Amino acid sequence: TPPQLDPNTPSPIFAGSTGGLLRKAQVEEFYVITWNSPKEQIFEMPTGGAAIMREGPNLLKLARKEQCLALGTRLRSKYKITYQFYRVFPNGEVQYLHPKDGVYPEKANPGREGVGLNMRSIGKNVSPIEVKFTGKQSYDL
Amino acid sequence: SHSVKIYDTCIGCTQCVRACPTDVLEMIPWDGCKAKQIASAPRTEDCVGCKRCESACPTDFLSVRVYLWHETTRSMGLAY
Amino acid sequence: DPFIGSLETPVTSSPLIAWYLSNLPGYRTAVNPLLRGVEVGLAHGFFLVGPFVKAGPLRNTAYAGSAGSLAAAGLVVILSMCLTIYGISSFKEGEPSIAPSLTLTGRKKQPDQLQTADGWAKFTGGFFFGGISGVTWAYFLLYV
Amino acid sequence: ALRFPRFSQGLAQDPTTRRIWFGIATAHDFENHDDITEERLYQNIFASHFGQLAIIFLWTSGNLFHVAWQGNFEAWVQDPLHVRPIAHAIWDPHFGQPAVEAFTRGGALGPVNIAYSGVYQWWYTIGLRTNGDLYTGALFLLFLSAISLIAGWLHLQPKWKPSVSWFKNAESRLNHHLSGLFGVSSLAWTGHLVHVAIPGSRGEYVRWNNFLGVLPHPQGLGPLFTGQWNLYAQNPDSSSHLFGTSQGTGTAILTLLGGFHPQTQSLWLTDIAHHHLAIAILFLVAGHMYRTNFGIGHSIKDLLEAHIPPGGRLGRGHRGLYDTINNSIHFQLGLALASLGVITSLVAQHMYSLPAYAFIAQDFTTQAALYTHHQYIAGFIMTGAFAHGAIFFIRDYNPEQNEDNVLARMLDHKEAIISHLSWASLFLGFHTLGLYVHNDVMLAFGTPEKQILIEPIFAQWIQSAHGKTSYGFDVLLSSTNSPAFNAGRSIWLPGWLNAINENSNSLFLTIGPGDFLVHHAIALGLHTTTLILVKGALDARGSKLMPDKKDFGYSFPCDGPGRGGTCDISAWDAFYLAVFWMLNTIGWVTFYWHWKHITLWQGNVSQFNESSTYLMGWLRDYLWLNSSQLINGYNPFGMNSLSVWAWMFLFGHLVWATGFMFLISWRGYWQELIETLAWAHERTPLANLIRWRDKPVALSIVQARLVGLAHFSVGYIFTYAAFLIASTSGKFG
Amino acid sequence: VFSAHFGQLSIIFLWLSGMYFHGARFSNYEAWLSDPTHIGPSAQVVWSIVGQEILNGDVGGGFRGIQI
Amino acid sequence: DVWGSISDQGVVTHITGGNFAQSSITINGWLRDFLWAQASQVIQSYGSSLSAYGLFFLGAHFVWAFSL
Amino acid sequence: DISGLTPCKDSKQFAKREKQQIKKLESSLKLYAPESAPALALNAQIEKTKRRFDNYGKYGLLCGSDGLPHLIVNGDQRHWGEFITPGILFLYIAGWIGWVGRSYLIAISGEKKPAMKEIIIDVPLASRIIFRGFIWPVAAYREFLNGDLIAK
Numbered sequence A: 001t002p003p004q005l006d007p008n009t010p011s012p013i014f015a016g017s018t019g020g021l022l023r024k025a026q027v028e029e030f031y032v033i034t035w036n037s038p039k040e041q042i043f044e045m046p047t048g049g050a051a052i053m054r055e056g057p058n059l060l061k062l063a064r065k066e067q068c069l070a071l072g073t074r075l076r077s078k079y080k081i082t083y084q085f086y087r088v089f090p091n092g093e094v095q096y097l098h099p100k101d102g103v104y105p106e107k108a109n110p111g112r113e114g115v116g117l118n119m120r121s122i123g124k125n126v127s128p129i130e131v132k133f134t135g136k137q138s139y140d141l
Numbered sequence B: 001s002h003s004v005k006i007y008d009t010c011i012g013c014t015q016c017v018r019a020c021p022t023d024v025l026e027m028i029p030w031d032g033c034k035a036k037q038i039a040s041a042p043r044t045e046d047c048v049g050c051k052r053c054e055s056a057c058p059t060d061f062l063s064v065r066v067y068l069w070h071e072t073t074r075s076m077g078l079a080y
Numbered sequence C: 001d002p003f004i005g006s007l008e009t010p011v012t013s014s015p016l017i018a019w020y021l022s023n024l025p026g027y028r029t030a031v032n033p034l035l036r037g038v039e040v041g042l043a044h045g046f047f048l049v050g051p052f053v054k055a056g057p058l059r060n061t062a063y064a065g066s067a068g069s070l071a072a073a074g075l076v077v078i079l080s081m082c083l084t085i086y087g088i089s090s091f092k093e094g095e096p097s098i099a100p101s102l103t104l105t106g107r108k109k110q111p112d113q114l115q116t117a118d119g120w121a122k123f124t125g126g127f128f129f130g131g132i133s134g135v136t137w138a139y140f141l142l143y144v
Numbered sequence D: 001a002l003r004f005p006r007f008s009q010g011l012a013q014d015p016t017t018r019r020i021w022f023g024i025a026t027a028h029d030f031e032n033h034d035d036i037t038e039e040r041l042y043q044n045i046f047a048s049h050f051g052q053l054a055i056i057f058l059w060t061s062g063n064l065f066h067v068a069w070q071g072n073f074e075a076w077v078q079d080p081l082h083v084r085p086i087a088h089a090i091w092d093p094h095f096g097q098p099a100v101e102a103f104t105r106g107g108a109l110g111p112v113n114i115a116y117s118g119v120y121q122w123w124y125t126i127g128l129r130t131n132g133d134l135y136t137g138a139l140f141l142l143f144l145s146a147i148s149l150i151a152g153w154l155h156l157q158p159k160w161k162p163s164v165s166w167f168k169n170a171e172s173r174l175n176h177h178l179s180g181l182f183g184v185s186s187l188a189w190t191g192h193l194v195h196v197a198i199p200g201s202r203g204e205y206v207r208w209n210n211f212l213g214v215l216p217h218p219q220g221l222g223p224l225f226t227g228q229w230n231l232y233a234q235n236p237d238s239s240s241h242l243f244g245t246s247q248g249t250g251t252a253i254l255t256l257l258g259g260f261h262p263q264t265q266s267l268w269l270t271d272i273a274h275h276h277l278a279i280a281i282l283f284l285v286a287g288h289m290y291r292t293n294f295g296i297g298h299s300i301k302d303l304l305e306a307h308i309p310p311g312g313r314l315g316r317g318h319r320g321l322y323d324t325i326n327n328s329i330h331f332q333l334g335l336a337l338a339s340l341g342v343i344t345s346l347v348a349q350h351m352y353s354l355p356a357y358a359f360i361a362q363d364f365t366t367q368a369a370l371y372t373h374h375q376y377i378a379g380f381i382m383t384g385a386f387a388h389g390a391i392f393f394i395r396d397y398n399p400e401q402n403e404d405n406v407l408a409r410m411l412d413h414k415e416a417i418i419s420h421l422s423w424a425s426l427f428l429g430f431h432t433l434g435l436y437v438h439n440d441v442m443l444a445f446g447t448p449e450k451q452i453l454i455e456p457i458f459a460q461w462i463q464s465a466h467g468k469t470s471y472g473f474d475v476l477l478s479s480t481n482s483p484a485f486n487a488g489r490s491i492w493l494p495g496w497l498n499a500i501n502e503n504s505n506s507l508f509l510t511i512g513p514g515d516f517l518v519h520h521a522i523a524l525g526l527h528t529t530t531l532i533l534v535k536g537a538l539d540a541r542g543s544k545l546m547p548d549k550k551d552f553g554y555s556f557p558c559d560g561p562g563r564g565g566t567c568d569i570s571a572w573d574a575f576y577l578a579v580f581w582m583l584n585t586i587g588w589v590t591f592y593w594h595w596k597h598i599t600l601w602q603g604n605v606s607q608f609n610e611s612s613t614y615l616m617g618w619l620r621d622y623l624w625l626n627s628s629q630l631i632n633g634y635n636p637f638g639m640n641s642l643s644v645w646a647w648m649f650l651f652g653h654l655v656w657a658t659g660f661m662f663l664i665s666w667r668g669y670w671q672e673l674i675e676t677l678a679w680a681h682e683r684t685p686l687a688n689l690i691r692w693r694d695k696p697v698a699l700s701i702v703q704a705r706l707v708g709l710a711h712f713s714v715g716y717i718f719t720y721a722a723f724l725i726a727s728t729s730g731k732f733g
Numbered sequence E: 001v002f003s004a005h006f007g008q009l010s011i012i013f014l015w016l017s018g019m020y021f022h023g024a025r026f027s028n029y030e031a032w033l034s035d036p037t038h039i040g041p042s043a044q045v046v047w048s049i050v051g052q053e054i055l056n057g058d059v060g061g062g063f064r065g066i067q068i
Numbered sequence F: 001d002v003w004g005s006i007s008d009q010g011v012v013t014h015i016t017g018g019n020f021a022q023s024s025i026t027i028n029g030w031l032r033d034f035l036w037a038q039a040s041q042v043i044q045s046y047g048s049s050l051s052a053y054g055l056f057f058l059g060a061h062f063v064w065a066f067s068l
Numbered sequence G: 001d002i003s004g005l006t007p008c009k010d011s012k013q014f015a016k017r018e019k020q021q022i023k024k025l026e027s028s029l030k031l032y033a034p035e036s037a038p039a040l041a042l043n044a045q046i047e048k049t050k051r052r053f054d055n056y057g058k059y060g061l062l063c064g065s066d067g068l069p070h071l072i073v074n075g076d077q078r079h080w081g082e083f084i085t086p087g088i089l090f091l092y093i094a095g096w097i098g099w100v101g102r103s104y105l106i107a108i109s110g111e112k113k114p115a116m117k118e119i120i121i122d123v124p125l126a127s128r129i130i131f132r133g134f135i136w137p138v139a140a141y142r143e144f145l146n147g148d149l150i151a152k
């Protein structure tokens, strides 16, 4: 799938709180989650309190990926809404984060490369004495 | 970043992929099981170490293993 | 911005509070740090002189106040040390200032030079000089 | 690689504060530093050994110098029984006038501390009588420390750097350590005792400037070479001898009298010299067993391999053990720690029943302090032995090379060992607690005659077998006519029986029903601690709850909430849990010893004989009764010299309680609190100009457990030391 | 919830009835009434099986029992 | 400061003689004049009608340690 | 006699302790009226104390120096009743209990869900099993000889 863009999406109606962004967002990174709602309704923010999502496209800024994924999974489970989130850097780079292939990870998709596979039982790992004085680890072999 | 490894005893029940809170694991086609699929952990750098994938795994011993390793801002769960 | 971790309250955002805090020597961006540090040290030493002479171990004898004054001066020295190292581990020789660049309205403004090696060094020197001067003035006014 | 932990990049990359906390914690784990080899590890160990030797020598030199400069050794040597030794002076700007006037003790002109270490008697016994001797000793020890540092620096250099093949030469090292380290040192000590200490005991002075013109024996070296050794045991010191004077002395230098010197209540110096001579001869003879470059001797590998019983009841026997021991250093550390702990416990048990220093038996506080110190040290060492054994199992064990040898069979049947240890512990604890509760209830209801009191007949019989006539049996040495008695009567029993049959000394004190329960409690504590440590060591590589424990390492927090929850699953947690039991057992032993000895010294032994059979007697007649003088160190009216101890008492309590904070409350609460505090610091004006460089985070799990254990141990030790010293020194009896 | 409340009320009433019965039968209330200052209240009497009879103290008024 | 006894003359003698105002300002005073001084009765109650209390004073202690 | 112990009838501290106990009881006895029930209870207590001391003197125990009886667990034939016989009785009772429990467990192991039988005991089967423990040593010895005691 080709990554999308989020040029000028508006934001939900919130009154403000103390659970928002901090110095890390200005210094290190933050995250942006965008979705589409068919009607105006009230949802619960991960940072505390309740907000109202405008009908149409909605955009939100958060601090960590866990909050974004929790909000997205709540939206999918309760409202049946498609969502996607990116990560934003101080220099202006925007990196597409949620589904990279265009399909959800729980669904098998052809053309996916396998990482971290060991073709043996968990009890076939070598003893730590065999890998001593080397930079490798037993489970890495 | 912690280390997540997958062994060949997996039966492709997709519980670990659903349990992950940071979208680390996904599913790929495979050949040596009835379900014809197997899990993988590409986005290793986003792991926090909650070990929910190990909590949801039916096997004699877990086919997904998490080993704690060098910590950073992402793995420490810091928002400030 | 409702999504920033801060709230707007009458105490945190009032014309009187804003004016009073912006007129404090620690927030004057245009002024070079030495003149601000001198005032800060003067005020801090003048305040610090009192409790040592009023609750010191020798507070009942005739030496009391004099001894207390000395103690106050010693504290200032320690505080000056606690400043100097804080500069050395924070600001490098060639890096620019790290202060915010734009104001609340959005206008671009020159960043403060206090968050710089030379600026912090000037601030610490002025603080030391002002603290010593304030301690001496307080002692002279109290026991002459 | 660029931050403070230069030996670990992984710990140097993270931005939190734990990078500091762990940086101190892993500085001595040479096997964890990246890019490590065997050569570097061995050389670093060698340099650390040299540094430790230098530190020990510097500490001893400092003690000697302070005793010489601010002590009263010259005043103490004249009247040992009526002078309090002085350790060092006190300078304190916080002292008030009453404290200055109350802390002046002895002949000093200012505040001083009384030395309970017991070095005054040790230095007086060996022949030191002046401050110049102490100054010379301090100078020599400083020179030795400098030499040790120089040697360490020299052997850290490339040209003089040894190789790994040098560090693995077991036979040569064993020969050299058995011959020169243990035998030659004992021979030199015997020479010192004959040449300097004994003449000093008889009123003569022998020093560096006149030791070549004085003959230790009038006969000379003739009898030794010719053969008539008995000439060296002709004229022993008389029973009217006064230490340090020429009244009623003798000329013999090696005897086997036995017993104690009457005036000093200590062992004879000639006996000590004779013992050292015999020990040195035995070690010199026995240090020739193993093979070296001369083509004669034994090979340890063949000795181990040749010991396999026919019939296969022991598996393959001892095959492959030589390589396992030689390649792994944790095995060697565990063996050395076990041996050192046993030796320390033996020293603690021996130095109080057979004192070797003059006028130390009449100094009660020194005896109690030394016993408690050595027993606690031995307990800690014994715990460390099992800890390093578990580390060895985790790291340096190879299942393939150790196939079906004794180690494999040990790992084969851990379940039986654990089950039997658990059975023994349960049995002992159940029955000891039941008997104690029954006796307590019987005393509470007012009918003491219904108590269950059982005599320790076995120990009494053993005591009677040594020549004690307080029970009635006549066995072996007690009977007048017997092979043992007739064989030994001519030489050592005439003094041994006299020493053992006196009631003043602590040699084989009388025992009754009150010691039975305490001994069984000690056995229960030993069994439970051994069970904990053995389970931790054996279950290190894996179990049913986690069959891949060896992959994670020696120390790791947990394995998550899955499978019902797995907390404290590692072996580090097993050592952590056994530390508490070690402390409790040592506390019980010290309580028993202190109460028995304080009742013996106070002149009444019926109090312990009667009140030690129930726990209310322990609570009322030992702690509450003896704390009255300690808690009165400072009162609203005034204070005395005990005040400091009282302060320390309270201090210890506080630390103990603080440990509980780290031992119950866990991490998430504090992490949320830290997040809230960080927000509060960021939002405030005039304080957001100052910003941190490392992000503050709460402590880890293992780190918090370690901190809690350290607080617990510090509070325990400080509180007991303060109570013991204050109670024993308030009465001086 | 309603049924649990009713059961709790029944238990409380049983406890009160037991306290009143103990006050009525095994007590020195009548002796304490005349001289309240010099007599200690007592409403429990211990059996004489094992040797626990020492728990029957001299509360006063010609009675032996546990002071309440 | 409150409880005590009165003689016929009119003087009042308190149980602990009014030592609260000078001994309760330090932790050592709390440990010595309250915990140590007032625990004499509980540990010396063996063989009397209060002995049961003393037994409890031990038993609870055990339970506390067990909790650890 | 043994380990410097005195027979309890000869010792004087035993009689002294009896005198102290009797005096302590009579001190409280003197308060109440002769016809009052507390006087009868205290007289019964005094009689019980005297009988207990007489029995302790008769049984031949050895009081120590403090005047309290001591127990000998050596195995001396003169003191077998203090430890050895109660030990044999306790061993018999414990073997009975253990054999009954193991027999019930083996009996209920056959069914499909023994857990429901453990949480809800069945009374007829347990009643049948219980009385077989009267002959537990013989059955245990025979099972050990056959080889049915230890699982394989």
Ligand code: CLA
Residues within 6 Å of the ligand: D045, D046, D049, D050, D053, D166, D167, D169, D172, D173, D176, D177, D179, D180, D181, D182, D343
């Ligand atoms: C005969 C010559 C010789 C001698 C004297 C030594 C001696 C020593 N070697 Mg060895 N060594 C030798 C040959 C020799 N070596 C050879 C040929 C090799 C090559 C194979 C080695 C290989 C070697 C290595 C690789 C190392 C040593 C180390 C050491 C030191 C051990 C630490 C210590 O001080 O123990 C002190 C020991 C004792 C005091 C002896 C008695 C101990 C018992 C337990 C005490 C008895 C108690 C008694 C009552 C004392 C009372 C005290 C008093 C206050 C009352 C010590 C200096 C180690 C070291 O520390 O290096 C600096 C080290 O790492 N050695």
Ligand code: CLA
Residues within 6 Å of the ligand: D024, D025, D026, D027, D028, D029, D030, D380, D381, D383, D384, D385, D387, D388, D391, D554, D555, D572, D575, D710, D714
């Ligand atoms: C004979 C010497 C000896 C030696 C050379 C070693 C060697 C080793 N030990 Mg072993 N050990 C020993 C004895 C010894 N041990 C004993 C006696 C015990 C029982 C207590 C242990 C128990 C033990 C454990 C539990 C562990 C080791 C481990 C290790 C290794 C890591 C070292 C380290 O990280 O420390 C550096 C540590 C510190 C500098 C920080 C802790 C310092 C403590 C908390 C100080 C106490 C505070 C102080 C007293 C407060 C004073 C306050 C004042 C009021 C009094 C190292 C190879 C570790 C391992 O993993 O090995 C692979 C490990 O986990 N050891």
Ligand code: CLA
Residues within 6 Å of the ligand: D422, D425, D426, D427, D428, D429, D430, D433, D524, D528, D531, D532, D577, D578, D580, F062, F065, F066, F068
């Ligand atoms: C003083 C309190 C205390 C006590 C009594 C115990 C007791 C015990 N510990 Mg624990 N422990 C404690 C504190 C304590 N611990 C602490 C502070 C720690 C540090 C974390 C540990 C850590 C620890 C470890 C690591 C281990 C133990 C083990 C044991 C057992 C040892 C075997 C034995 O002695 O059985 C004697 C049995 C008893 C004294 C238990 C009490 C019996 C009661 C009084 C009888 C019940 C009768 C009565 C009718 C009650 C009815 C209740 C009512 C509601 C009806 C035993 C259960 C060991 C083990 O489990 O061995 C199998 C073991 O491995 N303990």
Ligand code: CLA
Residues within 6 Å of the ligand: D424, D427, D428, D455, D456, D457, D458, D459, D460, D515, D516, D519, D520, D523, G073, G083, G084, G085, G087, G088
């Ligand atoms: C269960 C383990 C056990 C353990 C670890 C200890 C431990 C100890 N005992 Mg104790 N003891 C035990 C059980 C135990 N005892 C029993 C069952 C009795 C009989 C009442 C005694 C009676 C006893 C005496 C009289 C003395 C000690 C003393 C000691 C110490 C020295 C060792 C000794 O003398 O060997 C004695 C070792 C044993 C007898 C081994 C017993 C092991 C078996 C398996 C116990 C169960 C057997 C069973 C009940 C017997 C048959 C029943 C019978 C009626 C037919 C040591 C602290 C001595 C001491 O130093 O006191 C200061 C001492 O004087 N013990």
Ligand code: CLA
Residues within 6 Å of the ligand: D419, D420, D422, D423, D426, G098, G099, G100, G101, G102, G104, G121, G126, G129
């Ligand atoms: C059914 C009978 C039963 C039997 C035959 C055994 C047998 C045994 N136990 Mg086990 N055990 C039982 C129940 C039983 N246990 C229960 C209920 C518990 C939980 C409290 C335990 C917990 C346990 C521990 C912690 C240990 C043993 C150990 C042992 C062994 C040594 C004996 C001993 O130390 O006793 C110890 C006895 C106890 C701690 C209590 C058991 C007694 C209970 C109260 C009665 C069981 C009766 C049962 C309710 C009868 C129902 C049948 C009826 C319906 C017809 C031995 C194999 C020890 C070992 O491992 O040795 C190798 C040991 O460490 N057992």
Ligand SMILES: CC1=C(/C=C/C(C)=C/C=C/C(C)=C/C=C/C=C(C)/C=C/C=C(C)/C=C/C2=C(C)CCCC2(C)C)C(C)(C)CCC1
Residues within 6 Å of the ligand: D330, D331, D332, D333, D334, D335, D338, D342, D385, D386, D388, D389, D390, D392, D393, D537
């Ligand atoms: C974990 C581990 C470990 C460790 C271990 C340990 C730590 C142990 C200990 C142990 C011990 C700690 C032991 C002890 C022992 C002892 C003994 C064995 C003793 C004996 C004795 C005797 C025999 C005596 C005798 C006698 C008598 C009685 C008297 C006189 C005479 C005579 C001498 C004869 C190791 C490293 C190996 C490795 C593996 C694992």
Ligand code: SF4
Residues within 6 Å of the ligand: B004, B019, B020, B021, B022, B023, B024, B025, B046, B047, B048, B049, B050, B051, B052, B053, B054, B066
């Ligand atoms: S430990 Fe947690 S974050 Fe890491 S892969 Fe498993 S479920 Fe995902």
Ligand code: SF4
Residues within 6 Å of the ligand: B006, B009, B010, B011, B012, B013, B014, B015, B016, B017, B039, B053, B056, B057, B058, B059, B062, B063, B064
């Ligand atoms: S939970 Fe375990 S078995 Fe199921 S898909 Fe994941 S790794 Fe495979």
